[PDB]
Design a binder for this molecule. Structure first.
Ligand SMILES: [Cl-]
Ligand SMILES: [Cl-]
Ligand SMILES: [Cl-]
Ligand SMILES: [Cl-]
Ligand SMILES: [Cl-]
Ligand SMILES: [Cl-]
Lengths: 174, 174, 174, 174, 174, 174
């Protein structure tokens, strides 16, 4: 079949298609998180913007994987995309906890694919993940952890005040 | 009589004059709200500015209706303007609640005039309201709802602190 | 009560609130005059613009009085606003005569408040009126008088011609 | 037949073709009006320019309808274009009266097509007319009405003087 | 419940959520179409770019609907997203035929929601669709129809040549 | 009658009015040709643009004749405008053949009027045609002939391919 494919296992090809589904799932989760914080009865603009930006980031990660799949001569295969785990996301703290859980699941999927690529002696795949995904994920998880700590310190006995202040003074808004 | 009037019912003409009175009433309400928050014993500059801007907006809406009345060949008729419902407006929360009530009453008057225009097969009137009023009102009511949520979250057990913080960190001031 | 109020009589405070009502009444009168001259069966654009500008000027005068009321520690109190004296304003000459009458009534109210301020030994009030109102009114009444003379000279036996020419060659239009 | 046509009735398609004929008729009427006022024995340059501009406007309206007909998958069908109603157009007043009559006939045709579109549940057609035709027509009829009033006021007992003055001081010329 | 919701039916709210699912489905379909034409054994860059741009457009339409849902005080509810109808999309002609079918299904959903909004006397919804969706869809379907005609004329007896030429000389590429 | 007319025969005056009708007929023919090539089932943008430009050119020629008629003191007289000869224009080749036929008929009318002007010893008319019409027509007919030759060479056994290529590589498009 493929005129270009070289050193690209069927196992890696399938795992890349699965990883695309995971990233598009994550993008959809962030879309939902974003619009929840835009509700008039929630109304935390900086929180909305934070998650909308992540929805775009995860979309872009999926696109990069798809580009790479074609560069290697694999075939993109798309599956249904499950809806996010919740319809309502609670407080900023609840939301940021759910986001860290989601990011750790993406990071583990990256690490798992690196293990497979390594076992298949596929250095192009391994360096692709190293160069465009692993550090991006470490940096984002650090950021989220920083945010969680600041959110947690602001709860005190005045949760509403703290949630407002975090949105106003840490998160980016107009 | 009119050399230009075409497809413009007497019912619509009268309802437009009434709507002008409603908008000028609303402008006057906002003038009063604005100067209340400028009192030395109230002194919330961002709140003052918010309502003064709305007084100008409602004035402008009345002017647009009057322009349209002449464009269609109707006759502007002005009636007395009642004073606002209160002389003192309480807290920012009280004020923002009164403002949302006022805006919903203007929105219902717009919707009622759209019903009449539709029934009179007056598409110029219907598109005039759609193009220059309905979405402006939806956007403003959303904004006010967002504000109400943030005000409410800041009350906690420290109402003065929360009222200060909202004025400082959400509303526009010098 | 007031933490800032000093040398500010209740009599002056009330008279300022009344003067605000007079200026907003005058603004409303000019709004009506303006839209009358915008009628397709009247259609004197320069006349329309002249009165619309005065509606804005009178609004601004009311706002300045309200600002001053708060600066002195008085309390703004708003009353109903009566509608203008006429629904239709006749010729440019009729309109300019009504405007001069209106301006002389505002000027007399200014002068009356100056008398009260003087009697109450309130030099801040007296200089406020001198600096921001008295000369503005003298200048406007002179302008209107100039206009009345030119309108009157153009009536001749050809009233329509003269009314057109005055609008075209004295008043500001596009 | 058509690969793109959706929700586009034969009735609307035919009425659009008729409306194109009406607009091109109107354009031709304005061409004739324009060149009449360019005659050396008429010689009212501002009047000539006014009508030549309207000939272009009506041409453009016909072109927009034709574009829309193709966008919806209808078929443009052209019919003969009748010549204007007069060869000589009388005074500026006669001409402006004929123009208002013409514009009211175009406005009624627009309104009639809106009724048909509404009855056919064709919201694209209805919004097309609302967005690009109805307000343009209301604005033009208001302008013409304004002009008629000023022309009429200038007739007096000196018709030639008034006709000159209107052309010089209201209408655009070099 | 909602502090802002006014004249916004539960029926419209649900239909908007369904329409979001339809637009995100369409975006996913275009993502798949785009990456198919990027395959080394397909390799039609202009075709790839055409569909990738549409994936972004449909995403943006879904985002606009979600924004509007919150502006009106409805609640966004997300459902699973089905995968596209095909894994391989055939020729440019096959692909463009599938795209027109997809667009006509989105257009019918828009028209159906307009019918519901009209029946619910919801003019804000109706004008929202008119202003941001209906004409965009008519323009896109016209474009696709134009493309289909040119593709079809190029098939002749030399399908590969024609498919190359269309991609090179009609579609945008680097 | 005319204060300016000199050396301008009634025969020339009438022939100029007829020539205006011919040019406006030709403009209408080109309008129809243009919109035919804009049909979604025809879709040859460069061909559409070619004929739309000619519709404008022929309109302008009619306007120049009308200007000249007034400059000489003749009287413009407009007649009904017949619709174009066809509703559907076939292939680019069919269309370009019809256009050359049309242009040769305009050229012969120009030449015929030059004969009349010459016989009437009307050098202003003769030079007017020489300076603004005769060479423009020769240049356009040469262009059309060039186009016909290239269209004809591209028919071969692959008519659709050739028609596409001509539109793409000879005619001006976006
Ligand atoms: Cl699920
Ligand atoms: Cl009252
Ligand atoms: Cl009264
Ligand atoms: Cl006729
Ligand atoms: Cl499925
Ligand atoms: Cl015929």
């Amino acid at each position: 079949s493929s005129q270009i494919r070289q050193n690209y296992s069927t196992e890696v090809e399938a795992a890349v298609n699965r990883l695309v589904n995971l990233y598009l799932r994550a993008s959809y989760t962030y879309l939902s998180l974003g619009f929840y914080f835009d509700r008039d009865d929630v109304a935390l603009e900086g929180v909305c913007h934070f998650f909308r930006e992540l929805a775009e980031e995860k979309r872009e990660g999926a696109e990069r994987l798809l580009k790479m799949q074609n560069q290697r001569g694999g075939r993109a295969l798309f599956q249904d995309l499950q809806k996010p785990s919740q319809d309502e996301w609670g407080t900023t703290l609840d939301a940021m906890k759910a986001a860290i859980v989601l990011e750790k699941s993406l990071n583990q999927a990256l690490l798992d694919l690196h293990v497979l690529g390594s076992a298949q002696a596929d250095p192009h795949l391994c360096d692709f993940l190293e160069s465009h995904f692993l550090d991006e994920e470490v940096k984002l998880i650090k950021k989220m952890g920083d945010h969680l700590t600041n959110i947690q310190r602001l709860v005190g006995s005045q949760a509403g005040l703290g949630e407002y202040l975090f949105e106003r003074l840490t998160l980016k808004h107009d």
